[PDB]
Amino acid sequence: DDALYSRQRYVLGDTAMQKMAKSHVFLSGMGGLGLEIAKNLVLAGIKAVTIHDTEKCQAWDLGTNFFLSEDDVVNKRNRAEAVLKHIAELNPYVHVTSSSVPFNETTDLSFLDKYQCVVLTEMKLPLQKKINDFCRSQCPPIKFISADVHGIWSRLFCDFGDEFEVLDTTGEEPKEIFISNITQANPGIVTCLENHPHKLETGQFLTFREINGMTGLNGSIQQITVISPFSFSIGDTTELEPYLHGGIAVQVKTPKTVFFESLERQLKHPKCLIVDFSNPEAPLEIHTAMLALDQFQEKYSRKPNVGCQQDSEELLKLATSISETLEEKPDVNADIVHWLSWTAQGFLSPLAAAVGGVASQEVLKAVTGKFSPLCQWLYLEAADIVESLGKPECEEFLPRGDRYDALRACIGDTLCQKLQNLNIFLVGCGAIGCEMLKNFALLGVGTSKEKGMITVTDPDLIEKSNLNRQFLFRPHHIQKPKSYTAADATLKINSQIKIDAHLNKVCPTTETIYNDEFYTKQDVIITALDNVEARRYVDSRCLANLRPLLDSGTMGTKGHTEVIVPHLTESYNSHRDPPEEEIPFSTLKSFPAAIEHTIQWARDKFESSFSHKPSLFNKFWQTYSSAEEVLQKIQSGHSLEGCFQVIKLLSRRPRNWSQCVELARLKFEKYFNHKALQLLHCFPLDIRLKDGSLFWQSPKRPPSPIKFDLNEPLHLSFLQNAAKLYATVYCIPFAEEDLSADALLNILSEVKIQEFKDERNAIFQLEKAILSNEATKSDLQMAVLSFEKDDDHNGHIDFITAASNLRAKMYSIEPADRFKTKRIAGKIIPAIATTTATVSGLVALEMIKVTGGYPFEAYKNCFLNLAIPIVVFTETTEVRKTKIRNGISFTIWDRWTVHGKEDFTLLDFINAVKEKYGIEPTMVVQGVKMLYVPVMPGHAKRLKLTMHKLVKPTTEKKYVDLTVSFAPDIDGDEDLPGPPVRYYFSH
Amino acid sequence: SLEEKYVAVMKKLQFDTFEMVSEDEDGKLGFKVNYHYMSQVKNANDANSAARARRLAQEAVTLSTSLPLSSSSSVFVRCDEERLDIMKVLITGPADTPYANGCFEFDVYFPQDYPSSPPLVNLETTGGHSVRFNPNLYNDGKVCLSILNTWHGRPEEKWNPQTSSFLQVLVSVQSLILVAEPYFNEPGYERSRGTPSGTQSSREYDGNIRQATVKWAMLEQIRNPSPCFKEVIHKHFYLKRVEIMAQCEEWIADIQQYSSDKRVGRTMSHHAAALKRHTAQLREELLKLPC
Amino acid sequence: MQIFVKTLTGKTITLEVEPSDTIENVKAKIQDKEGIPPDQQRLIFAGKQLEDGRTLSDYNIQKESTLHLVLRLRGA
Amino acid sequence: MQIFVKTLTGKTITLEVEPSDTIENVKAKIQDKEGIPPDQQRLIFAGKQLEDGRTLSDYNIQKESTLHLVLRLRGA
Numbered sequence A: 001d002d003a004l005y006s007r008q009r010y011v012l013g014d015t016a017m018q019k020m021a022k023s024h025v026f027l028s029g030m031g032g033l034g035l036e037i038a039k040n041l042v043l044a045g046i047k048a049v050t051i052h053d054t055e056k057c058q059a060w061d062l063g064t065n066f067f068l069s070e071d072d073v074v075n076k077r078n079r080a081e082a083v084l085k086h087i088a089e090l091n092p093y094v095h096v097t098s099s100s101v102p103f104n105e106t107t108d109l110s111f112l113d114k115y116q117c118v119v120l121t122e123m124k125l126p127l128q129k130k131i132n133d134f135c136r137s138q139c140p141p142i143k144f145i146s147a148d149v150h151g152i153w154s155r156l157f158c159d160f161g162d163e164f165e166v167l168d169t170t171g172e173e174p175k176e177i178f179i180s181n182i183t184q185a186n187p188g189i190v191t192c193l194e195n196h197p198h199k200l201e202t203g204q205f206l207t208f209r210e211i212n213g214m215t216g217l218n219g220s221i222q223q224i225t226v227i228s229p230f231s232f233s234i235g236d237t238t239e240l241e242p243y244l245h246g247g248i249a250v251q252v253k254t255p256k257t258v259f260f261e262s263l264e265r266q267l268k269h270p271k272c273l274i275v276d277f278s279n280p281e282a283p284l285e286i287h288t289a290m291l292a293l294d295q296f297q298e299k300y301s302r303k304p305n306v307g308c309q310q311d312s313e314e315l316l317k318l319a320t321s322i323s324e325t326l327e328e329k330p331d332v333n334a335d336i337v338h339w340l341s342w343t344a345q346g347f348l349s350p351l352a353a354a355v356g357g358v359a360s361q362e363v364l365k366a367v368t369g370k371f372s373p374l375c376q377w378l379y380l381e382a383a384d385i386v387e388s389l390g391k392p393e394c395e396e397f398l399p400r401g402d403r404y405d406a407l408r409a410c411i412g413d414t415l416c417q418k419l420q421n422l423n424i425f426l427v428g429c430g431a432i433g434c435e436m437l438k439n440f441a442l443l444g445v446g447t448s449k450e451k452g453m454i455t456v457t458d459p460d461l462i463e464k465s466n467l468n469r470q471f472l473f474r475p476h477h478i479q480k481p482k483s484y485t486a487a488d489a490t491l492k493i494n495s496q497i498k499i500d501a502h503l504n505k506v507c508p509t510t511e512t513i514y515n516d517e518f519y520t521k522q523d524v525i526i527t528a529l530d531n532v533e534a535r536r537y538v539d540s541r542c543l544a545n546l547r548p549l550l551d552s553g554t555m556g557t558k559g560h561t562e563v564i565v566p567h568l569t570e571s572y573n574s575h576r577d578p579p580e581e582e583i584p585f586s587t588l589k590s591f592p593a594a595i596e597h598t599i600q601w602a603r604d605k606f607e608s609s610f611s612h613k614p615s616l617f618n619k620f621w622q623t624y625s626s627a628e629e630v631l632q633k634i635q636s637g638h639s640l641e642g643c644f645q646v647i648k649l650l651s652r653r654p655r656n657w658s659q660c661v662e663l664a665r666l667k668f669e670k671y672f673n674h675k676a677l678q679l680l681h682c683f684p685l686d687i688r689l690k691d692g693s694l695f696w697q698s699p700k701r702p703p704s705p706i707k708f709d710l711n712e713p714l715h716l717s718f719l720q721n722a723a724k725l726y727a728t729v730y731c732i733p734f735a736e737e738d739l740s741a742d743a744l745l746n747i748l749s750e751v752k753i754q755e756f757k758d759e760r761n762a763i764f765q766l767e768k769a770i771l772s773n774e775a776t777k778s779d780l781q782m783a784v785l786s787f788e789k790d791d792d793h794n795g796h797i798d799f800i801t802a803a804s805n806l807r808a809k810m811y812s813i814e815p816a817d818r819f820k821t822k823r824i825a826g827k828i829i830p831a832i833a834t835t836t837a838t839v840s841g842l843v844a845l846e847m848i849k850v851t852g853g854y855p856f857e858a859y860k861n862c863f864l865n866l867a868i869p870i871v872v873f874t875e876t877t878e879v880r881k882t883k884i885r886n887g888i889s890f891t892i893w894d895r896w897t898v899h900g901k902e903d904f905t906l907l908d909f910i911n912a913v914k915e916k917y918g919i920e921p922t923m924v925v926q927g928v929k930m931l932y933v934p935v936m937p938g939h940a941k942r943l944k945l946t947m948h949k950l951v952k953p954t955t956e957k958k959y960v961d962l963t964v965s966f967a968p969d970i971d972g973d974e975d976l977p978g979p980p981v982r983y984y985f986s987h
Numbered sequence B: 001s002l003e004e005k006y007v008a009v010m011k012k013l014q015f016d017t018f019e020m021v022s023e024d025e026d027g028k029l030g031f032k033v034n035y036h037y038m039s040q041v042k043n044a045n046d047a048n049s050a051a052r053a054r055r056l057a058q059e060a061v062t063l064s065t066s067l068p069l070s071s072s073s074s075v076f077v078r079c080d081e082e083r084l085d086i087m088k089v090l091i092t093g094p095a096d097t098p099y100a101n102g103c104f105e106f107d108v109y110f111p112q113d114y115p116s117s118p119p120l121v122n123l124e125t126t127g128g129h130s131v132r133f134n135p136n137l138y139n140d141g142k143v144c145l146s147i148l149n150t151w152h153g154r155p156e157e158k159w160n161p162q163t164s165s166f167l168q169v170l171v172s173v174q175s176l177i178l179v180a181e182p183y184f185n186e187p188g189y190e191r192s193r194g195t196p197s198g199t200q201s202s203r204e205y206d207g208n209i210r211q212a213t214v215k216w217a218m219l220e221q222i223r224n225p226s227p228c229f230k231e232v233i234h235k236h237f238y239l240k241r242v243e244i245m246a247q248c249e250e251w252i253a254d255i256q257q258y259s260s261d262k263r264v265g266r267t268m269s270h271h272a273a274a275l276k277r278h279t280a281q282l283r284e285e286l287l288k289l290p291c
Numbered sequence C, D: 001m002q003i004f005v006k007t008l009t010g011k012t013i014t015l016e017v018e019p020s021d022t023i024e025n026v027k028a029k030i031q032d033k034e035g036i037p038p039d040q041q042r043l044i045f046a047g048k049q050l051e052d053g054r055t056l057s058d059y060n061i062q063k064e065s066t067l068h069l070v071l072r073l074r075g076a
């Protein structure tokens, strides 16, 4: 059902969606990691999923699982059974089952062949080796995945057998290029059009079509060899006809075969993936340390104790023994070993969340082969947290008997105490918001009774499609405020959470309730927005309050994370974003060449015909009460705005259903027949240019008129949708049976079609309507519609698709289906749960970095693309130095102040600035409303006016902020920018 | 000598401001004059843009003096007294064109991200979307210029924030669009330059344009002048009445010379009848014009 | 007789010309001052693009006037 | 001096640069083949983003090193 997988289909595809069905996967170990990976996989929607655990619930697990409660801990239920009910609530279409079969060396592995992929959590290494050996020997081989988390460390392993096949390396759609020239040479040469470089790489494959002269190349495939940005090399072309013109090339994708290794073989040289190029050698050391920890746990049948120095020495010796044994013989990081020993038994939530997201994505890659899988190791960690901790006392890490024992072992009690007193502000309650709330609940943020508070605002109501990605809601929550549902769901997980929820939407108008004192009371701001303008507005707002700001964005398998800290980094507005491009107007109107052109043309025509005209009609007829009055004013020559359009529409007003059918027929005829005739008449096919090039050359494609035919399903759907829209817009009722093909055919059997080739006429038609009693008040009313994408019966999507396909066939371009056109028209952003979960984990991880007041070096920004897959970490931008004159300089965090009085004047302000900051300005504007410019006439006398009168502020505001500039040192230059200055009306 | 007086008088009315939008105690914006982008102005309430203010401040110094001014053609500009992001620009048809002594008002808006993006330009004097005065023009007042359009094209044919200036945008308009042979601004038909068919097509286009502009460029403006440019219009036409009448009679004589043709005879007769009808009323409209 | 000029980059060039200077001359003359190609050497004085053959006093231009530069047309 | 840049989605480009060449020109020479504005692109090298005005000697960028191009996202 698309109503649940609209977004997911864009990411995956139909064939991958089918392969997604009829799938069985086994899971072992429902810890926190197992819980969240199972949640993500259920959200994906696999037909059958099997989970397994032989352990029993414990009170300590309450800090790692958000679905457990006190009753299950009391009853000591098997963890596999205590949650099986809740997981089914996410997706009824997903069949979930639990198991508790004990696992050991002598357990038979034969039953495991039922599934196609196995993921292990909290398992002993030799048994994992045995399982991998068994699974990899299967025919067909069964995908194997291993992952674990210990303290602030995690390990990822994968194996898809000796050989694996991937049907799509990247998933990015192939591009299209047009042929400018072809040289009959050995090897052949093809020249790209002027500008628009092909942007290709040697070795890629492509196909051709619609070539004049060299027609033999049509339908063949070549391999390219790029020569210039606008040329390349192809196979020999000496044997063919000369190239006349035409020629369209598109890249041809090719499946790729990859290879893996056995776990044990990889153990002697793990092929890790570099995520930070500052220390590319670190993952090898991390792998060695993990191996040493596993060896210690095997030898002593236990984990090291925090602060136990002898265990640290033993583990260091073990690591030294293993490291030399390694193929590459790396060095030993004693600090790494010491920290791993210190917090071996700890557990961190956000790192587990991110690891689970990436692991779920890898599972999808395993079951579908849609993207390039990771090969063959991965290690994530957050040592920067303890890097600035120095040498803490093990006493602070001792448990006290609460749900926060694991995190206390991770970071120390004092830091957790600081977390419970945080007033955090969040904007937007989208998919990322729910994960944020879950992480905060697991972290016990703001749980202190004294202080610690959360604020969330979102005006949106719950939608059916959103439940695919948003888990905190339920199908029976449709058409409810997001904020309150999310708050209730969070409070159910943890009762101590204190949440403030609003239905407000952040915007400049609502700034009154979100005054500066509100921002100052808050401690940090988190953004999960889908548009950049809100990002800019919130960044500008928080810049006035000097508060840390966090932002993230996602799209498909791509995401980005940004951190902002006062006085140290740069702002979001410090960098630009790629604005959306627009095709030249003339191309859309006259010579479309892409399906999206026709889609946008149809959308714009729909908007014009159903929104702009009715609105103008209603406004005109509410401007003037009497139509006879309007006729009298016209007869007296008074000019009226838009009079001709509205009078033409009124004269052509239908009355009954058959009139609507005739109007639809006429509009169809004009849209899809007459325009091509007129364009051909004005522009013949054979006309040439000054150089002799034909006018109807690529990219322009000559159109063709097409005759009406009711038998066409496209025709039928188009006419039905148009008639329905017309009937709705004119508020004329109808019956569904009228839409029967036979009835419509009977209606059209008596309608003529015109062939192809002022104030007096308008006055005559208006007077005729007046004498025909067609100027009633009800007639001076017109229905106005709004575009809806989620409504499956209004027919907007159906009509738009029919129109787009019709116009595509006008220019003989391949049509598109319903869903692609729906996505293109609606600007629907494809999204998936794995990327959102991972970016949420990253944000939660850096949140404590912000909280601890860590130095600038600790913070990192992450960019990733799971499709490759690829992950990169960087240090954030340092704030830049901006000088003006005389050595005076300022940064983005600067803001100057002036204290005035009731009689304060402009000259007073100018002189005070000149004295206090040493230099005298040249221009002042309040935001965009200019207050004084010497160039403009009459502004000289503005120097002698009261600032209260000249500004006209609001009584609630005891100050104001203004924009300033200074004359450049040398004339002919722009005024040197300066920090905004906050004027105070009084002390 | 008369051109000198015209230049001197029009120089003082070169640049000025006007009150177009007021605010109540609630901050609502009331448009005292008709504008094209009122919705966009109201929606764009953010004052985050600041570099735009500096850019406009630097520009206005050049705009105060560097504007073209001559008897053949000139430009006029008005701005809001408080806001500076809105602007009305009036352009007159230059000499030796079918637009001789025309009047054309354009609405220009400056986006928040300016000068990162070219400002918006539209024509308002389109005769109620009835007339297409130029191949690069449209009934809605939109314009075909790749220099404003941010598309692939050429790097030199894009709005470069470092180099492009709105004054140069205005300068581009006159001898590129407002030309003596606007029919040859349409690509493909300059290929047939020198052929009699192209000559006849250009003649028919010119007659259509001349009657359209005498309708919607002088009579409409004198009857219903925009409040920002009322005085400018009246002081212009008053000092040009006799010359305009003489040149109008010249056009009337010129057009009828092709009424004997058969291929374009009907259109020429239609244009002649319309032009004579317009001129009849225009005569008395001129005679009643005060100083 | 020099005459001032305002180009796109804003620099005000003012070079000696003669009353009989024909625009064919200046087409090549001003080429290398900015590398501007002659086809892109589209100018207006009196708001009007000029013609190669005519001289300066043909349009009765005065000494030390100021004209402006524009670039090639291309449509939608 | 040969240098490579690998942006997301697997695209790898071959560039020719010299150590004293400054960063704005460095990001300029990619527009001739990609078209992105220099201010529209962010460049990363070994976890340190390249500030404007410096040169390759400042960042100790050597031959055959790999830099990456990144972009922000908006969806949520």
Ligand SMILES: O=P(O)(O)O[C@H]1[C@H](OP(=O)(O)O)[C@@H](OP(=O)(O)O)[C@H](OP(=O)(O)O)[C@@H](OP(=O)(O)O)[C@H]1OP(=O)(O)O
Residues within 6 Å of the ligand: A589, A605, A608, A609, A667, A670
């Ligand atoms: O209102 P628009 O969306 O701008 O569309 C108009 C409109 O057609 P519709 O009423 O079908 O929308 C015009 O018809 P009127 O409303 O003025 O009667 C029509 O004029 P023609 O009947 O002369 O074709 C014109 O087409 P054109 O610009 O070719 O004259 C066409 O514009 P588009 O189809 O390009 O939107």
Ligand SMILES: *P(=O)(O)OC[C@H]1O[C@@H](n2cnc3c(N)ncnc32)[C@H](O)[C@@H]1O
Residues within 6 Å of the ligand: A427, A428, A429, A430, A431, A432, A457, A458, A459, A460, A504, A505, A506, A507, A528, A529, A530, A534, D075, D076
């Ligand atoms: P996706 O749609 O999952 O996430 C975006 C959510 O943010 C909400 N939102 C967008 N814009 C605003 C403003 N200005 N204020 C409050 N909330 C906003 C959307 O409704 C989505 O829920």
